[model samples]
Target: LVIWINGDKGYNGLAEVGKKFEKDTGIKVTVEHPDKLEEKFPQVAATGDGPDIIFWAHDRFGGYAQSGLLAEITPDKAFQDKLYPFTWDAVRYNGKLIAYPIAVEALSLIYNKDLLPNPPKTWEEIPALDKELKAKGKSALMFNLQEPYFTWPLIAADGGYAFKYENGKYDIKDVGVDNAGAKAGLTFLVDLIKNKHMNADTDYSIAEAAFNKGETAMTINGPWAWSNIDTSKVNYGVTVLPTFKGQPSKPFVGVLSAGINAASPNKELAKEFLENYLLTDEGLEAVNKDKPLGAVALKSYEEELAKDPRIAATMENAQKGEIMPNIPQMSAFWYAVRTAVINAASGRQTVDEALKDAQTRITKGSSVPTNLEVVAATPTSLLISWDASYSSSVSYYRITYGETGGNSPVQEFTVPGSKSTATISGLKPGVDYTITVYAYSYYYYYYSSPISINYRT
Candidate 1:
């Protein structure tokens, strides 16, 4: 059997595995990574001119299905049964399967152990964390602020989604980036520059250079960033990205998948090679050995991968993450949102100010409830309250509290916004916890700075 699997051969992981498959199964595998797989794959697949199989991101799944440029292959339930539920759902387009989900990719928090010993659990902790890092002559954190992709976690964690995902359908008409939660999330990020913690003028080069040069202690980036870091200059660790006030930030998870070409002359052989060979444990392990960053969805392999804290943290985040919508309309959101965010970050406009305008230009609009204070503190119980948010739409408030370091129940409860006061009972006595109050309406959610106190019952 002969076929070319369109992927980065230089990565060596998949390529090496391909060689092993060849030696055993007499299949000749030639893998290559052209600079423009996104453009080339679509064009060539339409003409039956590309490789038998293409390894690419799940974002292209919808286009391929609509184009009829990809063959619909129903993955055996036996195999699908072993992967995460989201993995299969991500590969489906217009009720058809276009690809086999491989490694899941998303942005995670990376901190330099030498500078920031413990990464902040949430954005609320970033301020003090910033002070200490700066005192040590290092920037608290830095990433490409101009790019919305990296900064999206700020909005997403607080419930600002690109599309209102309902019943597994992307409601393109319902864009949430201009909503209150997104503005609140965007405001938090821009304030980093507003406060001078993050350099307002910084772009990709400056931010990347800062991280690589040991000038920055923490950053939100993917595994690819590690390759650029000078190991001699920094000792770092990766963890799940923290949230705004207390909500979890869910970055867009991109599944790296192997898609079959509808036009491939060797369709049967390609199917057999992918299904019978590459889909097995041995095949995945072989590729993973070369590229340790593989975040495969196979449960057993995922568990084994979790042994590495970074992989575990990443997978956990993905499990809770919003799937990057594969619909065509989403293409517009990326551009419009990024520019609006950049304007806000640069102080050309306030979070709400720029967001509202972007709502028309892009489609968006957070200063929120303030004077939040812990009215009572105790060992097993506490009473907490906050001032009101100006937004009239706020129907209620969500109070979330949890132990400082993996202590107890880190769950959330809600109260009517009109009733600011809340009493949480259930003593843990000596354990300390973090508390965050969120104002909610049908359109958006806004979080108060997390306040912490020991609850002694």
Candidate 2:
């Protein structure tokens, strides 16, 4: 059997586990990494020839779900009960279980105790202190514009959400990129970046190095960096990301999970291997060894792991970490929001422009149709036809219609991939209505324009 991992670190970790599994079970296992992973993943998945099991974060996995590349896991209740609520929920798509979660890394604010002395309790205090320090040619924040992982926590504290899920589906209509809290987070970062209170030059490696050298005072990072940072040189402490105006600031918690390939030739063996290895105490401990940061499934191990300073800090901050939505359409939200944040941070666009652009892109691609034509109309219902994009990969379509604009949809239909036209029934004759269609490609979906029509008695 074969497995694919996203990074060398994860590859090495899983390879160690694979060796043990192979030795114990006598099942040969091979691990491979895709080149230029971000670009190669979509193309490989588009062809339907990906890995049997892949190691990836929940946020990055959104695109795979959107493109319909992952297989759902139907673990029994016994297996489900053993997992952490946040980790288990992060791998679910459309109410169907998609992956077996292995571990999680939550974000937090890490500071040099010697410099901060007293860390700010909230977002407002952070900037004020940064300004005070800037006057003395000192710096406070280390934020990297190139990495979206660091920005998401600040956005969440300001109450920004990428997408909303309702009635077993994601409501793509509400794009939270420009929400008040989101804007506040953006503005705060911009001030630090432009005012020299924070060093925007600090990339991932630079930030970790600077913190180790005592060059920067504070940074938002995950538990993965603890091993690399020099904790001995200066006193350091970890805390949850600061709240904004007393509102809770939440970090993006990324969970790693194992997914099976539906088309694998050895499905039974793979399933049996997963059941025997993944759900057992030895399997969980083997995968978790040396990864002292994330939460694990085995209850016996949680307290021991939590004893480590880094792990303890992570758990404290995790209460403020929000699990990223695992829905298939969630990919669009990340791409759009990331682009907006990047553009805004770089001064390429105003915050409003970035936010509006994101919303418009999502709306145009996913909202219901606005104009409609009726081929036939009756007192109770109407039959309609419209031009639809043809694609062999599409497996299903969703149609939604409503009487009041922007309220919950009144009717919905899920149809086979080949059907282009649908009939609307149980409508009042002579009343005007709005309708929209969404095309589903295995895991992802795209919305069409809302069509309007009148039915006459």
Candidate 3:
């Protein structure tokens, strides 16, 4: 059996588990850790050859499943009841379970214990804390100010959501980022910046570095931040984020999961390995050999792992978190909301103007290029054309193409906003290929959700 992992090659956590699987089942397992597995997997899988299994975050599940790259999986009732309910939600694509979750994580308030013995419990308390910290040459809190992923708790403190979810599916057309509840949330965030309680320029680097140096008293981050903090030897404590406007600030729950490839010849064997070996207690423990996992999926292990306060804090946050939506439109949500937040926080635009503009880009189909067409120009060439994006900020269009079924290396081309057509010349006849187009709005640090098509030459 073969598997693809996106981590470092030297991280033999999965390799160690493979050894055990081979010893028992006599099925030699090979683990491949490749750069840009997400990008490379689709190219290879479209042509019918890729890893038997793929390990990645569940956020990529919807795109892969929609493209016919992942096999549908259904674990038994016993297994279903053993893992956290939210983990199941993460792996489900279009209401079908397509992957098995291994670990889970969510954001929480992590503070320097040496600076504050007790973390603030509400948003109303933040201003006083910031003022007190300022006197000591420190800041009260920090986080990726411009990243929607890190700042989602603020945006979603009320009922804000990127897309409306109902009946176990997301309605891409129903974007609520500009709605009343979300507007209030955005107002709260803007007030923090306007009142000088939080820095407008603080990004992951600035926030993380400040905390690591003990120059910041608190940060909202996930379990991944623990290793760096531990290495820096800062005395820290983890707790759920403070309430906002009398409501709990909820973060997005993310899962690290493994899915079977649709093209794999060893389909049943892959399922057997996942069901009988990989999702078990022993496999979960072995996979975490190189580094400790955040909140594990197994309900039985929670009590033991929760003995460590850090794990317990993250678990509590995970329980209160909502699953990160896996729709293809999520790409647009991230770009749109992050740009909106930055614009509002930096005083470049009012919060209402920015969020309303974001809503327009996401739901109005104005920013994304439309009517994409691809045809064989010759046995060795192909022509691609698309309608121009209506976004006034569009600077250029990026084109990426590769042979289908892993026959050739992927290639890229960039064209100015003036041109909507591109021609590719290559000497390959009777081969299937895939082409994708993206609108880059360089000024706003935004790119439209990609449009793709498949053709044969």
Using TM-score as the measure, the top candidate is 3
- Ranked by lDDT, the better of candidates 1 and 2 is 1
Query: Once superposed on the true structure, which residue ranges of model 1 sit more than 4 Å away at CA?
Result: 6-35, 230-232, 265-268, 362-457
Q: What TM-score does model 3 achieve against the real structure?
A: 0.80
* Candidate 1 lDDT by residue in tens digits, 1-457: 3333445432466677677768877778777767777777766655437778887778876666555567778768887887888988788765567788878877888888887778888888887778877887877888878777888888777758877766545555477777878888888887777788887677778877787778898878876676677464678788988877678888888887778888777777777777777777776787777656457777777788888877777787788688888765565678778778888887787788776665665332322343344443556776554543233456777777887677666778888755645777884777666776667766674544433344433
Top candidate by lDDT: 3
Ranking by TM-score: 3, 1, 2
lDDT of 3 by residue, 1-457 (tens): 9999877422477787788889988999999988999878876775567899998888876667655568888788988898987788889875678999878889999999999989998977988899989999998998889689988787788878877766656666788888877888888888988889898898999999999999989999988788899999999999988887887887888888889998788988888887778777777667666767768888877666888888888888888777898765677788989899989888899989999999998886443565566522667886565654233456888888888768666798888875666788874788777888888876744464677888888
Off by over 4 Å in 3: 9-11, 366-456
- Tens-digit lDDT track of model 2 for 397-437: 67777774446546888767655456778876665577656
Residue 61 lDDT in candidate 3? 65
List the candidates' TM-scores in order. 0.73, 0.68, 0.80
Candidate 1 overall Cα lDDT vs. reference? Answer: 0.72
Candidate order by lDDT, decreasing, is 3, 1, 2
lDDT for 417 in candidate 2 is: 62
Q: How many clashes does each candidate structure show, in the order listed? A: 12, 15, 1
